[PDB]
Write a protein that binds this ligand. Structure first.
Ligand SMILES: COc1ncnc(C2CC2)c1-c1ncc2c(n1)n(Cc1ccc(-c3nc(C(F)(F)F)cn3C)cc1)c(=N)n2CC(F)(F)F
Ligand SMILES: *NC[C@H](*)CS(C)(=O)=O
Ligand SMILES: [Zn+2]
Lengths: 75, 578, 296
């Protein structure tokens, strides 16, 4: 399969995720194509954060799905 | 960043498979050149008396062919393809002569100044190179870059005298240059969507354009403005052709209709017959005035020849109903499935036919016929697990298998599992040994098991980009082929084929508990039974112990790597006596 | 009353308390629990806060903190994270109502995604629910421009090539976003951080009015008035004292005057005076982070 990701600038990045992997593999691919450490990324899909340690079949991600990329701002 | 690949195809491909992208005509010899989405270029004979029209083909590209131009009075042919390569051929014998690889992305445009002998090429990388033909046939040639541009170029045209060149891009703004001085002249705006067809007069005074919006505009190069606008087409126009004296235009697009629109008065309209697929790259027969024929191309593998005789005398009912000359075409593959044991492939093509392919031997063993795909897939179920080590690409309507450095050597299988005649084989290593077999560097004073058929093309390409080489498995023992192979192959292929380096293996931990060990992935549970028996003694091992995983009794032949994948959901086992 | 180590939950609670139709709905959900047997905690805090408003005319926000594997000890966290956590904990309504809507109506909408191959000109439509809009602050100077960048025609070229199954090749496509259902209040999330890890201190001129009809799917005529802003105060992504300012919704002379919830001090400002603070006319220290647009 093929999914899209909206980075910080607003551009779109394409991934071939093979929907049987965990969130850590997706974050690793995002870091490979973006250079952001995987411990500071916050993936958001359908207005709900993607939690680690789970596959993608539970989130029913299919076809072309956009995942919004945001960081974490602490205070 | 280098991937080795090869395709599975028949020795003599005689019919089109995927479609047609460009057309050309040779009135001197009465031949037709068909550069389709399939990588092969064919030379048909357009004589009606030839019941089997076919001449030698030209197979050297690895992807789609976008446009071909017949140069030097039909002696040479220039072809541009999706992979960033522009080649030079010899149309009299159909063999390549040169190659130009100074492009970054796809190439989609190609012009020709007949009275000047120049060729210009444009692509998705937003560059335009001016090439002189006379220095191409005889030969690191020099470059003449003429590109002030900001987005991808989808079509390009040049006038007959080679003094004006116009390009169309996604800005809906046409840019006009000058080949001799490489200067900028005009900036023609006033379009809405992509422009995919440009036609210029012989003297370059007027220009015709057709956009994906669905409108045809007549420009002027003596006055930076548009003159007339026609919207006879409901959908976008993809093809455009004109008469000799800029008096009539033949158009067609996604509408699946072909019109003949007048230019002086756009209220005269005749409807040539409608094709069954979106018409693209329409071609005209210019033997005499008026043109007595027209060749159309579509997204399906068939080329028709409509006849125009009712024009100028017709006084909207279609003029034709059937074509006069038909060229047959084959069937392309639209679906594939890799079986549980990663050797065989089940492919379903158009006209609803399913075939059973092989990968290691690179051949087809059987065709199953008219059966449902889902039931056939469910019937062919095997209780094994072998990690994937290749990929299948369905472009060009044929089977293409790509091997990547990451996971080519990731599949170890037993000797009897592979079917040969205990050795622990490696599928990727055997395939890579079989491919480069005539290479003299691999010899010593697919090695001893099988042999890939000696006509499979071998391609060394970059990661989703230009292909650095293209080789035939049979033609590898020569001089030039060896010279290029010494530098084109990557390192990880050399360390496996040229030198005998054993690729690494895999291990997995598993917890044993009488309700930590490291063992090879393809280890049968038969050995875990023999291990627990011989450690806790106070045929015999087979009969007096049985292992349970998730409360399922384990068969003493299925190995550890499929216990994890099919039964377990680190792995843990339990054992009970008797 | 409010010790300054919980600066995110405090601001989120203060913003949510003034949201339309929130304190009334939560009282109803607890009333259903009241006769059937996080919701019980929220109703307790709302009662306590309303007691103080009578006097003016130790709140202890830690009761929620204890009830809400990422919240251990005295640490620093995000505001949008706790907002999403609270809005996700509020599941409970569905479980209660199954046995026989405060987020699906207040904070919920739908989108439409269109992709168009440039070779075959074939479209494709998908539907995705959105709870907030993440908008680019600045390109690698207007709210409308930022929203347009977020949702308009954008072409995916280069290595990001669309794989069209009608052509079975890697083509080039264009994408678009459309709004189908707009919630009662629409929140905007500003991506202040820059990948370059950094922080941009140049704000955007946030208007006091809005209209979503150019990017909408149906012809509608409704406005959007700003009523709450959450502002950072730091210079990097390591710390910073959150601050929240909320408009008065509906006491005899405070109407139409913005508030300013500083650290354990309530200050009343004016609408004209406040509008000149977060604007880029004068280089500020605080940078807006979230914007809440109540309808009408
Ligand atoms: C956990 O805390 C909260 N959780 C949720 N929500 C809220 C606030 C009200 C949504 C708080 C909260 N946070 C800090 C407060 C606080 N409440 N109060 C009580 C108060 C009393 C009068 C007013 C008021 N209303 C108007 C009106 F009606 F004109 F708009 C004008 N004024 C001044 C506002 C708040 C207060 N004194 N502080 C500062 C100190 F406790 F540190 F001292
Ligand atoms: N970011 C934490 C809240 C503000 S403070 C004063 O604790 O740092
Ligand atoms: Zn397409």
């Amino acid at each position: 399969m093929q999914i899209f990701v909206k980075t910080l600038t607003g551009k779109t990045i394409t991934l071939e995720v093979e929907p049987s992997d965990t969130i850590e593999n997706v974050k690793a691919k995002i870091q490979d194509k973006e250079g952001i450490p995987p411990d500071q990324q916050r993936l958001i899909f359908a207005g709900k954060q993607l939690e680690d340690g789970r596959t993608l079949s539970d989130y029913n991600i299919q076809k072309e799905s956009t995942l919004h990329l945001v960081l974490r701002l602490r205070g | 960043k280098v991937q080795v690949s090869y395709v599975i195809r028949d020795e003599v491909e005689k019919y089109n498979r995927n479609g047609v992208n460009a057309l050309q005509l040779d009135p001197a010899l009465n031949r037709l050149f068909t550069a389709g989405r399939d990588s092969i270029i064919r030379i048909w004979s357009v004589n009606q008396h030839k019941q089997d029209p076919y001449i030698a083909s030209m197979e050297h590209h690895t992807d789609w062919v976008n446009d071909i131009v017949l140069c030097c009075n039909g002696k040479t042919l220039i072809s541009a393809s999706s992979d960033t390569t522009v080649k030079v051929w010899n149309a009299h014998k159909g063999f390549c002569m040169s190659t130009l690889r100074t492009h970054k992305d796809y190439v989609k445009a190609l012009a020709y100044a007949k009275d000047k002998e120049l060729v210009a090429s444009a692509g998705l990388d937003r560059q335009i190179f001016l090439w002189d033909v006379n220095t191409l046939t005889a030969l690191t040639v020099t470059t003449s870059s003429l590109s002030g541009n900001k987005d991808s170029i989808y079509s390009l045209a040049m006038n007959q005298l080679g003094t004006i060149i116009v390009s169309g891009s996604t800005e809906k703004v046409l840019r006009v240059w000058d080949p001799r001085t490489c200067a900028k002249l005009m900036k023609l705006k006033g379009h809405t969507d992509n422009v995919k067809a440009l036609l210029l007069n012989r003297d370059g005074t007027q220009c015709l354009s057709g956009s994906s919006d669905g409108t045809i505009r007549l420009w002027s190069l003596g006055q930076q403005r548009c003159i007339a606008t026609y919207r006879v087409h409901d959908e976008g126009v993809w093809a455009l052709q004109v008469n000799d004296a800029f008096t009539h235009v033949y158009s067609g697009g996604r509408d699946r209709k072909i019109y003949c629109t007048d230019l002086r008065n756009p209220d005269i309209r005749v409807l040539i017959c409608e094709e069954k697929a979106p018409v693209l790259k329409m071609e005209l027969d210019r033997s005499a005035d008026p043109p007595p024929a027209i060749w159309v191309a579509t997204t399906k593998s068939t080329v028709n020849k409509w006849t125009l005789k009712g024009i100028h005398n017709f006084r909207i009912t279609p003029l034709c109903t059937q074509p006069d000359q038909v060229i047959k075409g084959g069937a392309s593959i639209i679906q594939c499935h890799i079986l549980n044991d990663k050797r065989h492939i089940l492919t379903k093509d158009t006209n609803n036919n399913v075939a059973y392919w092989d990968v290691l031997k690179a051949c087809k063993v059987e065709d199953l016929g008219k059966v449902d795909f889902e039931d056939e897939i469910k019937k062919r179920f095997k209780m094994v697990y072998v990690p994937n080590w290749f990929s299948v690409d369905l472009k060009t309507g044929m089977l293409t298998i790509t091997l990547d450095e990451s996971d080519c050597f990731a599949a170890w299988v037993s000797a009897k599992d592979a079917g040969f005649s205990d050795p622990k084989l490696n599928l990727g290593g055997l395939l890579l040994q079989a491919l480069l077999e005539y290479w003299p560097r691999t010899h010593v004073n697919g090695n001893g098991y099988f042999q890939v058929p000696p006509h499979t093309p071998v391609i060394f390409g970059e990661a989703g980009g230009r292909t650095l080489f293209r080789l035939l498995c049979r033609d590898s023992g020569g001089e030039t082929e060896s010279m290029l192979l010494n530098e084109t192959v990557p390192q990880w292929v050399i360390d496996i084929t040229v030198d005998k380096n054993m690729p690494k293996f895999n291990k997995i931990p598993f917890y044993l508990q009488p309700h930590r060990l490291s063992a090879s992935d393809m280890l049968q549970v038969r050995k875990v039974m023999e291990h627990v028996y011989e450690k806790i003694i106070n045929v015999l091992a087979e009969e007096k112990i049985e292992l349970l995983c998730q409360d399922q009794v384990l068969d003493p032949n299925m190995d550890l790597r499929t216990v994890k994948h099919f039964i377990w959901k680190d792995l843990t086992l339990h054992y009970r006596q008797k | 009353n409010n010790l300054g180590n919980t600066c995110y939950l405090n601001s989120i609670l203060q913003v949510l308390y003034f949201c339309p139709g929130f304190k009334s709905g939560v009282k109803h959900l607890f009333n259903i629990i009241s006769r059937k047997k996080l919701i019980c905690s929220l109703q307790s805090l709302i009662i306590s806060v309303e007691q103080l408003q009578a006097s003016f005319l130790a709140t202890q926000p830690r009761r929620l903190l204890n009830t809400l594997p990422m919240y251990e000890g005295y640490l620093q966290h995000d505001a949008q994270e706790v907002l999403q956590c609270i809005l996700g904990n509020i599941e409970t309504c569905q479980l209660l109502k199954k046995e026989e809507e405060l987020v699906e109506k207040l904070f919920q909408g739908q989108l439409v995604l269109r992709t168009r191959c440039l070779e075959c000109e074939s479209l494709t439509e998908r539907r995705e629910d959105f709870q907030d809009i993440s908008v680019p602050v600045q390109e690698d100077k207007t709210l409308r421009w930022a929203i347009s960048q977020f949702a308009s025609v954008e072409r995916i070229v280069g290595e990001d090539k669309y794989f069209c199954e009608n052509c079975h090749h890697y083509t080039e496509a264009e994408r678009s976003l459309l709004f189908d259902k707009m919630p009662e209040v629409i929140t905007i999330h500003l991506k202040c951080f820059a990948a370059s890890l950094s922080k941009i201190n140049t704000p955007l001129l946030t208007p006091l009015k809005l209209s979503l009809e150019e990017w909408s799917t149906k012809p509608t005529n409704d406005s959007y008035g700003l009523f709450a802003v959450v502002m950072h105060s730091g210079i990097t992504i390591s710390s910073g004292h959150y601050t929240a300012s909320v408009k008065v919704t509906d006491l005899k002379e405070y109407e139409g005057k913005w508030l300013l919830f500083d650290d354990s001090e309530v200050k009343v400002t004016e609408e004209k005076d406040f509008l000149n603070s977060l604007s880029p006319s004068t280089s500020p220290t605080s940078t807006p982070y979230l914007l809440f647009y109540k309808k009408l």
